[PDB]
């Protein structure tokens, strides 16, 4: 279950260093060991090593000795994973996991690139010509031209969870494009407001675009 908070996405140059954090909101991490897992885009899971947070004593997998450094500050309830001399090979999602009820963090996406952080332009997609299927309407949201990943997209701040389809982001010329659709019964919209909420942590951008009925197209 996801009970740990990890630092937001990171964009770092090749050769640099970066430190990722992992903390818990409802308990002290000092009593349970923390382990770090790496997952490269479209590949399996890799075990980095683990640490006893109370005293910071740790063990690293051979392949990460010298590349990774693990520490833990039990006064501020945070475990850290510092990676040095980053290469394209380090681009991945990193998860921390605690030895208590299988608690996992949500993951931190690290992108090793010399490209610039660019915020997305968000566009509301309202249906035209009265289009409906059965008695439902499909609305959409276009998140265009951002870098790096990820972008968090929710509908009505997260309450609107059923009938949502968020399409994986696609890279084109150093910029990503992502889209999402939500299908609701036609009794709901436009009577009730539908808002596309988009957050791009890397540029610390937050945008809500209300999907309103079209004027003449």
């Amino acid at each position: 279950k996801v009970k740990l908070q990890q630092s937001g996405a990171e964009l770092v140059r090749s050769g640099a260093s970066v430190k990722l954090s992992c903390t818990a909101s409802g308990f002290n991490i000092k009593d349970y060991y923390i382990q770090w897992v790496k997952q490269r885009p479209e590949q399996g899971l890799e075990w980095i090593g683990w640490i006893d947070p109370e005293n910071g004593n740790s063990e690293y997998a051979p392949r990460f000795q010298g590349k990774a450094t693990m520490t833990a500050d039990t006064l501020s309830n945070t475990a850290y994973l510092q990676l040095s001399s980053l290469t394209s090979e380090d681009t991945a999602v990193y998860y921390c996991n605690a030895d208590l009820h299988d608690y996992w963090g949500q993951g931190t996406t690290l992108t090793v690139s010399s490209a610039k952080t660019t915020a997305p332009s968000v566009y509301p997609l309202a249906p035209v010509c009265g289009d409906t299927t059965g008695s439902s309407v499909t609305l959409g949201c276009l998140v265009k031209g951002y870098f790096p990943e990820p972008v968090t997209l929710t509908w009505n701040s997260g309450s609107l969870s059923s009938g949502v389809h968020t399409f994986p982001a696609v890279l084109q010329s150093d910029l990503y494009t992502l889209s999402s659709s939500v299908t609701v019964t036609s009794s709901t919209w436009p009577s009730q407001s539908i808002t596309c909420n988009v957050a791009h942590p890397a540029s610390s951008t937050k945008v809500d675009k209300k999907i309103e009925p079209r004027v003449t197209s």
Binding site: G44, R63, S121, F167
Partner: protein, 219 residues
């Protein structure tokens, strides 16, 4: 390093059918303390992994009893007595008996469903993007099966292959279908020089393409 080999790598199952995932380790996982440190982890694409089984056969809290882990030494098996829609995702066996802890390559499970034709939706560019100079026409092909589908964009009859970005979702954990998004990007100028925008889909569910068009200054 103890190597973890999983078979099969791709598992296609019909709802209600049993399934079995094999996990072989290059060395014995029986630890001196008499216990065997083998766990099975599940991950739905784009989410944190979750553990299902630990110590070869002990089920985690909340994990349905349709899942059974068993085995000893170098051979372990995870059996699903009856596969349900939510079971789609990747399964990994992972060992903690030897240092470094190692993980299997993963077995991706997918449900073989009854065919479903896509429902096509089209969205002309928002007035907002237009004022910013760009024009993206979006086409959603929702809830279809199988995953294989082809989309062609036509502008006033002529096919256009440049400026098209396509993206598919993973298999839905409720109805087991796929959805696809296709965006055609143009400059505001090219957009306003034309009238009909057509999103055509070729899918096995139909002899001819399923088409959705949009004419400017019509609605």
């Amino acid at each position: 390093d103890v190597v973890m080999t999983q078979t099969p790598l791709s598992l296609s199952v019909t709802i209600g059918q049993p399934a079995s995932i094999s996990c072989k380790s290059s060395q014995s996982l029986l630890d001196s303390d008499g216990k065997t440190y083998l766990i099975w982890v599940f991950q739905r694409p784009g989410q944190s992994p979750k553990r299902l089984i630990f110590l070869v056969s002990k089920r985690d809290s909340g994990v349905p009893d349709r899942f059974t882990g068993s085995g000893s030494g170098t051979d372990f098996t995870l059996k699903i007595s009856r596969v349900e829609a939510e079971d789609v995702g990747v399964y990994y066996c992972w060992q903690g008996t030897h240092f470094p802890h190692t993980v299997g390559g993963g077995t991706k499970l997918e449900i073989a469903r009854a065919d479903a034709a896509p429902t096509v939706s089209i969205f002309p560019p928002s007035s907002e993007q237009l004022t910013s100079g760009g024009a993206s026409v979006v086409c959603f092909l929702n809830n279809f099966y199988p995953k294989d589908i082809n989309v062609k964009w036509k502008i006033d009859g002529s096919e256009r292959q440049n400026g098209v970005l396509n993206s598919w979702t993973d298999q839905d954990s409720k109805d087991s279908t796929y959805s696809m998004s296709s965006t055609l990007t143009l400059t505001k100028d090219e957009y306003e020089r034309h009238n009909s925008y057509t999103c055509e889909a070729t899918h096995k569910t139909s002899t001819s393409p399923i088409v959705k068009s949009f004419n400017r200054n019509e609605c």
